[PDB]
UniProtKB/TrEMBL annotation:
Residue ranges of domain Thiopeptide-type bacteriocin biosynthesis in the record: 2-291
Domain of life: Bacteria
Cross-referenced InterPro entries: TbtD_PbtD_pyrid, Thiopep_bacteriocin_synth_dom
Protein name in UniProt: PbtD
A Pfam family it matches: Lant_dehydr_C
Taxonomic lineage of the native organism: Bacteria, Bacillati, Actinomycetota, Actinomycetes, Streptosporangiales
Amino acid sequence: TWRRFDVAYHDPDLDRLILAARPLLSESPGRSWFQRHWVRGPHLELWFDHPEPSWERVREVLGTHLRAHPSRTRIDPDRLLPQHRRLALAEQIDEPLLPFYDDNTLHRAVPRSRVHVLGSAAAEDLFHDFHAAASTAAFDQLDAVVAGESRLGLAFELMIAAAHAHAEGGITGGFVSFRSHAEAFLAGAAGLRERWEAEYRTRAEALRAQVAAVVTGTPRGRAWTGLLDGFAGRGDELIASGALTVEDEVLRSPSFRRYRLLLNLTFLQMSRLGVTAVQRSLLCHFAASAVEEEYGVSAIEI
């Protein structure tokens, strides 16, 4: 059985709060993990499958940080609530959306089940295992961000690495998925796409250099794909047995479905690092464009 603690913190910059929580997720046996979530307003979630750290210990560590570094961002519930209602339906969340937590407060919360979305208890357990491993990796990534490294740059690296290692044909195969995701998000937004294209142009040479670096191989890339490798076999088995619901003519291949899962896990990591849905889709646009330009390929030609 899981324990879920919500830390209400309305400033979108959660990095230092997350780093303050690192000991709680690093000091005791058991699976522990964190994610950013929107229910009842922006908050950090800490998940533990073992009894330590206790509430007292959680309160000790986080109370100290909140006193020294309180969030000072006012939110607008009446503006957010329409968006939350859409998210609740799309994400199949049945929890109360109101009232929003007061800023800088700690709460016990309901350990939600995702079996209805993931397909089975086995699939849910796989995701827990992923979040535990990836939360540890996220601490180091967020350290880097706090120290001045680009959040989006770090996320881009993870995505390129995942595609190069885990997509049929490497980066020049996997990039098609990036274009697909970007267009799915845009949903016909010619104006937004134009902004994406314009920003891509300004960043093109740097993004292309980043793609080449990651294809050459970077420490962070190798570490990420190493983490993903640990889940690929289990993913394959659960996809095959129908225990994990993942829902051309290359859709039949377990190879593609594995890729899609591991890319999805990468997106979840990006969320942990504070990259929003719109930013993740922007990065997919950039990734598709950079790959096309660097390797002289076309998503539409395939």
